[PDB]
Every structure is written in C-alpha cells, then in structure tokens.
Amino acid sequence: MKWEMGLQEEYIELIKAGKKKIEGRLYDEKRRQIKPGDIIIFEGGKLKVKVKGIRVYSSFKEMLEKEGIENVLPGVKSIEEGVKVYRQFYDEEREKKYGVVAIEIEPIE
C-alpha cells in the first residue's frame, strides 16, 4: 500500500540525508493500517520512503527513549525537548487515546 501524509521541510532533508531514520506519529486510525513493505509519500511527493518497521509505544517519551532521539529528531538534545516538538502537533488526550508509533523508514531515490 502507498500512504500519503504531510511532513515539515526540515524533516524531509534529514531523512534524505540518512540522519532521520524514524518517523514518529500518533498511532491513530490512519497509521493503524501501515505495515512493513508499504510506501509513504511525504508532503505531496517531496519525498518517498519505504516502510521497514513498525513499533508502537504508549507515549512519545517512551518512543524517543527506545528509538534514540537522534534517530527521530536529529539535533534535539533532550527527551523533554523531543516531547515538546510532538506537543506542537499532538495533544495529550490523543496521545493517551491512540498511543505512538515509530515508523522505520528508508528514502527511495
């Protein structure tokens, strides 16, 4: 399957460069249908990636600690800062309701 989802510009570059190897998202209805082998089209075609793995957590904090913040949000020095990044996109109620998913990705040329 091929899935479409938005992605901020700064992350598009980090993924292409091989620094950002994980895409964190709310494990919501849309994300609950993704499996390794699928393809994700980011920000209207600015980047295409292959899904290599799916790991679900109860929170962004736990996801970041297990996946390694440098592999998810390159440059962010602390887990607290990492959680803040996600809070700008996802509220705590949604996080508690759906859980969080770490999508292992590989850029497609």
Side-chain angles (χ1 to χ4, degrees):
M1 299 295 284
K2 295 179 181 177
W3 310 103
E4 296 177 55
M5 54 186 93
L7 186 67
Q8 289 188 171
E9 182 178 301
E10 73 164 299
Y11 298 126
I12 294 179
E13 182 181 56
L14 289 168
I15 295 178
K16 293 181 179 297
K19 297 182 183 178
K20 178 168 169 59
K21 303 179 63 59
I22 303 297
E23 171 59 2
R25 295 273 165 154
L26 277 174
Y27 185 48
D28 51 35
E29 302 89 335
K30 179 176 183 176
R31 257 53 60 162
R32 291 176 175 189
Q33 53 195 309
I34 303 179
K35 62 183 180 300
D38 288 351
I39 296 302
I40 294 176
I41 304 300
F42 284 123
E43 201 60 28
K46 288 182 174 178
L47 171 67
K48 185 191 302 182
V49 301
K50 167 68 74 171
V51 177
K52 312 299 293 186
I54 293 290
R55 297 179 282 284
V56 186
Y57 301 93
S58 68
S59 70
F60 287 113
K61 176 177 176 293
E62 290 184 58
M63 183 272 288
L64 291 176
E65 307 185 312
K66 185 67 171 295
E67 299 295 334
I69 189 172
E70 183 47 50
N71 301 305
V72 190
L73 305 173
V76 183
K77 304 180 181 181
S78 72
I79 301 298
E80 304 72 63
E81 295 171 58
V83 177
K84 271 191 171 181
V85 176
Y86 287 116
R87 198 59 67 210
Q88 306 310 302
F89 301 117
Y90 319 112
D91 54 274
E92 306 171 71
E93 283 299 306
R94 286 163 69 193
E95 182 180 1
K96 282 54 175 179
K97 177 186 180 182
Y98 299 112
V100 176
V101 60
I103 308 173
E104 191 184 324
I105 56 177
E106 184 185 79
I108 296 177
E109 303 181 63

